[PDB]
Write an enzyme that holds these catalytic residues in place. Structure first.
Site, mmCIF file in Angstrom:
data_model
loop_
_atom_site.group_PDB
_atom_site.id
_atom_site.type_symbol
_atom_site.label_atom_id
_atom_site.label_comp_id
_atom_site.label_asym_id
_atom_site.label_seq_id
_atom_site.Cartn_x
_atom_site.Cartn_y
_atom_site.Cartn_z
ATOM 1 N N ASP A 1 0.729 -1.173 -0.086
ATOM 2 C CA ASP A 1 -0.070 0.118 0.071
ATOM 3 C C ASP A 1 0.732 1.311 -0.180
ATOM 4 O O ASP A 1 1.174 1.858 1.002
ATOM 5 C CB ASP A 1 -0.953 -0.156 1.056
ATOM 6 C CG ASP A 1 -1.946 0.965 1.535
ATOM 7 O OD1 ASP A 1 -1.951 1.914 0.442
ATOM 8 O OD2 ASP A 1 -2.852 1.025 2.515
ATOM 9 N N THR A 2 1.156 1.671 -1.231
ATOM 10 C CA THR A 2 1.931 2.938 -1.516
ATOM 11 C C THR A 2 1.337 4.436 -0.915
ATOM 12 O O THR A 2 2.278 5.240 -0.569
ATOM 13 C CB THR A 2 2.550 2.941 -2.865
ATOM 14 O OG1 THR A 2 1.413 3.298 -3.646
ATOM 15 C CG2 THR A 2 3.448 1.944 -3.261
ATOM 16 N N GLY A 3 0.038 4.161 -0.787
ATOM 17 C CA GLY A 3 -0.891 5.622 -0.167
ATOM 18 C C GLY A 3 -0.922 5.278 1.361
ATOM 19 O O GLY A 3 -1.389 6.160 1.957
#
Ligand SMILES: COC(=O)N[C@H](C(=O)N[C@@H](Cc1ccccc1)[C@@H](O)CN(Cc1ccc(-c2ccccn2)cc1)NC(=O)[C@@H](NC(=O)OC)C(C)(C)C)C(C)(C)C
Lengths: 99, 99
Positions: B25-27
């Site tokens: 999850d880069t967010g």
């Protein structure tokens, strides 16, 4: 390009010919943009994040250019604290995770 | 590996001796797992996303193996809708976004 993850992966996007900063988000099914008064028909939708659900407006077939790469698809507009580019558009620009 | 985004980037992790599935999850600034037991002391914390804030337990310096790559860092535990691996650990395994 390659974007490392030391800081938030914020990039410039173009929507309606105008520029915004948005988070390239592999943890997002959908693309969710901060409130903005786009023209056209929309459908009401509810989307869920960490704290629960919010109400958004679903616009279809919106062109969004991400860091110079063109995409077109569904954009959700509502009271998010950050613009989020989700997988529906990340796939269109050939974005992968790599380690 | 190289992971594309037509599906959710789910991977198997190993933590506290148990296997689980989590979302790359880069967010996410932080790593958040569904309620579970982890050894050692924790601190109450709050984290926020779309839909608002939740209360979590902050465990520091927790070893987690993500697709065979080792990380040792902060893991938050609470009523997250889904298990996510955030940037704090994605950086440890050398994960980047590429397009
Ligand atoms: C600085 O704050 C953060 O980094 N916040 C993180 C966070 O919320 N990240 C969001 C993007 C974000 C960042 C900052 C402020 C607001 C929003 C995502 O990276 C992770 N999140 C993780 C997440 C994933 C799934 C779900 C979920 C919801 C309903 C049913 C099943 N799953 C909820 C949260 N994904 C979503 O919320 C997405 N949800 C989604 O794809 O639902 C299928 C959205 C975006 C499309 C709404 C965490 C709380 C996870 C640490």
């Amino acid at each position: 390009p390659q974007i490392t993850l030391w800081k938030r992966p914020l990039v410039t996007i173009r929507i309606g010919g105008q520029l915004k900063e948005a988070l390239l988000d592999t943890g997002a099914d959908d693309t969710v943009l901060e409130e903005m008064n786009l023209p056209g028909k929309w459908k009401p939708k509810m989307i869920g994040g960490i704290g629960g659900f919010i109400k958004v407006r679903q616009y279809d077939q919106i062109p969004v250019e991400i860091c110079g790469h063109k995409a077109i698809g569904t954009v959700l507009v509502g009271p998010t604290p950050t613009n989020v580019i989700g997988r529906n558009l990340l796939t269109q620009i050939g974005c992968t995770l790599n380690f």
